[PDB]
Amino acid sequence: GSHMERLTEIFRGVLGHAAFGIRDDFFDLGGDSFKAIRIAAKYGPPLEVTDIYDHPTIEALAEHLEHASSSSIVLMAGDPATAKAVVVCVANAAGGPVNFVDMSRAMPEQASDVAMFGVKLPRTEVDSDGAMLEEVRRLSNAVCDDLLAATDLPAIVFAQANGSALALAITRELVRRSADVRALCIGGALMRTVTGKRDTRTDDEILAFLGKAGSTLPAQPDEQAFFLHDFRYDGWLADVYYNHLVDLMSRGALEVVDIPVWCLVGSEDPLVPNYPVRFQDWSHIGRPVQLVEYAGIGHYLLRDCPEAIARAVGSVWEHVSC
């Protein structure tokens, strides 16, 4: 029915109880990350997960929906009118712009000149690896189109682990169009040099992997279902694109871009513990390659030191300012 009526129905279904009003905070009574994703998915397209964080009440959220407006990116910090550069952020598997919330909230104090856009992951249904590669091309072109229509500022591409895959695509597209790309920043990932295997693991094996990486899996089976759908989809997409790039390398046909690459890694990351020798493999994509090492931190830099990641993005911009 109405905006607030659908919001109240979805909130009562997702939170557990019906004793809920339109002025109560979403987080002060059990709301979170997964529940916000589930809410944004059930409500429909025009609601984004970040709008629940900027508007954790049903009335304010419905007002936002009134003057709301489809884009492939979402503005998270700064304003392109006053800014000197923009940063396009791609999240890890099962993620999205939400992953950068904290980081965005640190940008005004760590990179005041830089605006932040987050890439939305539609997860379009496809029936083949070739269709998946066509979808990677379509999505990278959509992100580039929306970015070049949103701003004409120098652009930095930031990637979170698995998101690196899509990030690479975007960067390369932006070079084909001779757009103003000045840096590729990648967190908690390494360039893939060998053809990869497809993810045939069980849900429990994924839970163990995420425990090893330092993350817990949600308990609600619907939240788990959405998380695992997105996780396996993103893994498939990234595997396809990295295998394409590795084939290009095998034949010597991967062009090196004159764009610097920053590799931000936590020192205690159990997923890339061989980085001291492998981080330099980003030379296949761009040069020079710079390493920033965060001591005592694991894989999830955006969870454990988001302010420092904003600081790294500001540093990258000032390094490529002139």
Numbering used by the authors: 2656 to 2724, 2727 to 2979
Excerpt from the publication:
The paradigm monobactam antibiotic sulfazecin is produced through the activity of a terminal thioesterase domain of SulM, which catalyzes an unusual β-lactam–forming reaction in which the nitrogen of the C-terminal N-sulfo-2,3-diaminopropionate residue attacks its thioester tether to release the monobactam product. We have determined the structure of the thioesterase domain as both a free-standing domain and a didomain complex with the upstream holo peptidyl-carrier domain.
Additionally, the protein construct was derived from the C2818A mutant, which will be unable to initiate catalysis, with a goal of capturing the functional PCP–TE complex. The PCP-TE structure was determined and refined to a resolution of 2.73 Å resolution. The pantetheine reaches from the PCP domain into the active site, positioning the sulfhydryl 4 Å from Cβ of the alanine residue that replaced Ser2818. The remainder of the pantetheine tunnel is rather hydrophobic, with Phe2866, Leu2867, Phe2884, Phe2888, Leu2928, and Tyr2957 all bordering the channel through which the pantetheine approaches the active site. The complex is rotated ∼50° from the interface observed in the structure of EntF; however, both thioesterase domains direct the same face, the β2 strand, the helix that joins the β3 and β4 strands, and the lid helices towards the carrier protein and the trajectory of the pantetheine still allows a common approach to the active site.
